[PDB]
Structure 1
Amino acid sequence: NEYFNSINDSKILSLQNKKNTLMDTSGYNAEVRVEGNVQLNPIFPFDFKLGSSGDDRGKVIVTQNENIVYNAMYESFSISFWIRINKWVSNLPGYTIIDSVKNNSGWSIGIISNFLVFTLKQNENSEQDINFSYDISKNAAGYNKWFFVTITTNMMGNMMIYINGKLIDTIKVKELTGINFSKTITFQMNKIPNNINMWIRDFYIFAKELDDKDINILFNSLQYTNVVKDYWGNDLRYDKEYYMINVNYMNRYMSKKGNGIVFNTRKNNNDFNEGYKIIIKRIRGNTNDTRVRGENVLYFNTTIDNKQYSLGMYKPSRNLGTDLVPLGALDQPMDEIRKYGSFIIQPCNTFDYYASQLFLSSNATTNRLGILSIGSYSFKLGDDYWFNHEYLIPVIKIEHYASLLESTSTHWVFVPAS
Structure 2
Amino acid sequence: SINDSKILSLQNKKNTLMDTSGYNAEVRVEGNVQLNPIFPFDFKLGSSGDDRGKVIVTQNENIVYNAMYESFSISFWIRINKWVSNLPGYTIIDSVKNNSGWSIGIISNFLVFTLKQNENSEQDINFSYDISKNAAGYNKWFFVTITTNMMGNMMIYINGKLIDTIKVKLTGINFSKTITFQMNKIPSDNINMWIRDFYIFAKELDDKDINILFNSLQYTNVVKDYWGNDLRYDKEYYMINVNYMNRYMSKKGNGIVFNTRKNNNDFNEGYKIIIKRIRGNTNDTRVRGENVLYFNTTIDNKQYSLGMYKPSRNLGTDLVPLGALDQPMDEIRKYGSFIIQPCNTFDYYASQLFLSSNATTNRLGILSIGSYSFRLGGDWYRHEYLIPVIKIEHYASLLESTSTHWVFVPAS
TM-score by structure 2 length?
Answer: 0.98
Rounded to whole Å, the distance in 2 between the matches of 1:212 and 1:25 is 24
Q: Is the 8 A contact 2:7 2:65 kept in 1?
A: no
CA shift for structure 1 position 287: 4.4
Q: Is the 8 A contact 1:69 1:183 kept in 2?
A: no
SS at match of 2:240: strand
Q: Deviations over 1:216-256 (max 9, x none)?
A: 00001000000000000000000000000000000111011
Give ranges in structure 1 of 5+ residues lacking alignment. Answer: 1-5
CA shift for structure 1 position 54: 2.3
Rounded to whole Å, the distance in 1 between the matches of 2:103 and 2:148 is 13
Rounded to whole Å, the distance in 2 between the matches of 1:201 and 1:150 is 13
Q: Cα RMSD between the aligned structures?
A: 1.2
Q: Deviations over 1:89-108 (max 9, x none)?
A: 01000000000011111100
2:32 aligned partner: 37
Q: 1:96 to 1:69 in 2, by over 3 A?
A: farther
1:3 aligned partner: none
CA shift for structure 1 position 417: 1.4
CA shift for structure 1 position 341: 1.4
CA shift for structure 1 position 122: 2.2
SS at match of 2:133: coil
Q: Is the 8 A contact 1:87 1:196 kept in 2?
A: yes
Aligned length: 411
SS at match of 1:145: coil
Q: Deviations over 1:122-181 (max 9, x none)?
A: 22222111101100011111000100000000001100000000100010101x534110
Pairing partner for 2:303 from 301, 308, 320: 308
CA shift for structure 1 position 68: 3.4
1:246 aligned partner: 241
Give ranges in structure 2 of 5+ residues lacking alignment. Answer: none
Q: Is the 8 A contact 2:351 2:407 kept in 1?
A: yes
Rounded to whole Å, the distance in 1 between the matches of 2:321 and 2:349 is 25
Rounded to whole Å, the distance in 1 between the matches of 2:242 and 2:382 is 27
Q: Is the 8 A contact 1:12 1:68 kept in 2?
A: no
Q: Deviations over 1:357-409 (max 9, x none)?
A: 0000001111011110000011111120x211111000000000000011000
SS at match of 1:253: strand
Rounded to whole Å, the distance in 1 between the matches of 2:49 and 2:119 is 27
CA shift for structure 1 position 286: 4.3
Q: Is the 8 A contact 2:68 2:202 kept in 1?
A: no
Rounded to whole Å, the distance in 2 between the matches of 1:102 and 1:167 is 28
Query: After superposition, where does 1:51-130 map in structure 2 within 5 Å?
Result: 51-68=46-63, 70-130=65-125
Q: Deviations over 1:11-53 (max 9, x none)?
A: 0000111111111110011010000000110010000000011
CA shift for structure 1 position 416: 0.4
Q: Is the 8 A contact 2:77 2:143 kept in 1?
A: yes
1:336 aligned partner: 331
Rounded to whole Å, the distance in 1 between the matches of 2:309 and 2:165 is 53
Rounded to whole Å, the distance in 2 between the matches of 1:171 and 1:263 is 45
Q: Is the 8 A contact 2:35 2:43 kept in 1?
A: yes
SS at match of 1:137: helix
Q: Is the 8 A contact 1:73 1:180 kept in 2?
A: no
Q: Is the 8 A contact 1:229 1:355 kept in 2?
A: yes
Rounded to whole Å, the distance in 2 between the matches of 1:72 and 1:291 is 41
